């Protein structure tokens, strides 16, 4: 109807705002999510207000819309209407955080979706603020761990361990370790935090640059025979196997 003026929201969904004040002096709001109809009233007339619905299984759904129309917070509560099951915050910049909640209001799992679609999945979370972590990139997945301080994703190949750290502030750094004792074969590397590049050397000689981009990609570029200059062009890693082959 044209009694309501409708407006698209973070995610892909349009909330209709009653063009006029309802019979009780407020603005009535209706939205459509998971084939449900959600309704609420607000003092605001831009689409900012709380809506509710109930599901067929007597889940309570609640859609808090930010004043700025830049963020939706979608909550699933069980029958009581208090005990929270899940919460998704979605920004207009295509970013997100989804959490599944446990009894005692504890987060059991958490998914950060970046603007670009890449994701950080935290699972098996414990009291110490620790647990399992996974990074879903374009083409492949990295697996590792997290603490309260940092997430570490790890790629192993022979005696080599490559660790990609993401600080709580979001800062990326990378380390290479190799238990190999022989100079001729030991993989070693230095991290340039200014250029986000890990340069691998073997027996004093630079072999390759792995660049960890702000677009959450990893590229590889080989050095010449004597390791004096980079050769050819950087190449994107499409698959995990490629990372492993870079550690061989």
């Amino acid at each position, epitope marked *: 109807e044209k009694n309501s003026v409708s407006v698209d929201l973070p995610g892909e969904m349009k909330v209709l705002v009653s063009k006029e004040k309802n019979k009780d002096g407020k603005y009535d709001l209706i939205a459509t999510v998971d084939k449900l109809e959600l309704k609420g009233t607000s003092d605001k007339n831009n689409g900012a207000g709380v809506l509710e619905g109930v599901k067929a299984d007597k889940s309570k759904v609640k859609l808090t819309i930010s004043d700025d129309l830049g963020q939706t917070t979608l909550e699933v509560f069980k029958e009581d209407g208090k005990t929270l099951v899940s919460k998704k915050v979605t920004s207009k910049d295509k970013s997100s955080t989804e959490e599944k909640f446990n009894e005692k209001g504890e987060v059991s799992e958490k998914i950060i979706t970046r603007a670009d679609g890449t994701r950080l999945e935290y699972t098996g979370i414990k009291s110490d603020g620790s647990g399992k972590a996974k990074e879903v990139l374009k083409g492949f997945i990295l697996e590792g761990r997290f603490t309260a301080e940092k997430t570490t994703l790890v790629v192993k190949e022979g005696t080599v361990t490559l660790s990609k750290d993401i600080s709580k502030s979001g800062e990326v750094s990378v380390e290479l370790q190799d238990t190999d004792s022989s*100079a001729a074969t*030991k993989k070693t590397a230095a991290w340039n935090s200014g250029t986000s590049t890990l340069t691998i050397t073997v027996n004093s*000689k630079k072999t390759k640059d792995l660049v960890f981009t702000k677009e959450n990609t990893i590229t590889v570029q080989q050095y010449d025979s004597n390791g004096v200059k980079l050769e050819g062009s950087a190449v994107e890693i499409t698959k995990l196997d490629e990372i492993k082959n870079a550690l061989k």
Partner: antibody
Amino acid sequence: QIQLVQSGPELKKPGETVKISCKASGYTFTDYSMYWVKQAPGKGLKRMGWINTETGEPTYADDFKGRFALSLDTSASTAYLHISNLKNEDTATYFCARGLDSWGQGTSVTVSS
Amino acid sequence: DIQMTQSPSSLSATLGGKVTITCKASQDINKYIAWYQHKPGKGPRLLIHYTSTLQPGNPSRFSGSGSGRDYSFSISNLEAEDIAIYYCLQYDNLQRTFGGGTKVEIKR
């Protein structure tokens, strides 16, 4: 195994030239730059230069311009050090080295009348 | 070229002891230090690389530690056959440079 084997001891007079060889075996010669290092009593080890085994391009330390040249026979996996206008200061042991793990045995040069 | 300041220049120690040599770089060298033993009439011999890796063919009495600009190397349980000049080498740069050496003598 991997070996670097250098040419035998030399005695030269001032103003003469000497050419010291370093023969590499057990690896692909072009995979590693060759370093030359000077050892005189009263000094330790000082890098004289290095050469890119693939391109042949030498890079010289500041103190070793003018009289010193690095060259290659890549097919024979042999690197050469040349010194012209020999002076008393060139009396030293000279070593070739590749990577961190390979050294020649040294070449003793005595310049004297 | 990076300056590598090696200390001390000379060491005298009793059999069975731990001697330590330091090497201070003029900038961060990213753990790219190696340590060589040099005995009369031979090529230097690699003992330690990448700060703390022991090269095969050598006893684990030889060790190394450090990061950034500051590095150390130790011989534990010093033996009579450890007499040698020892050198640090930085290889962070193509223009590799050496410490000035440490002559290790036995006190008896």
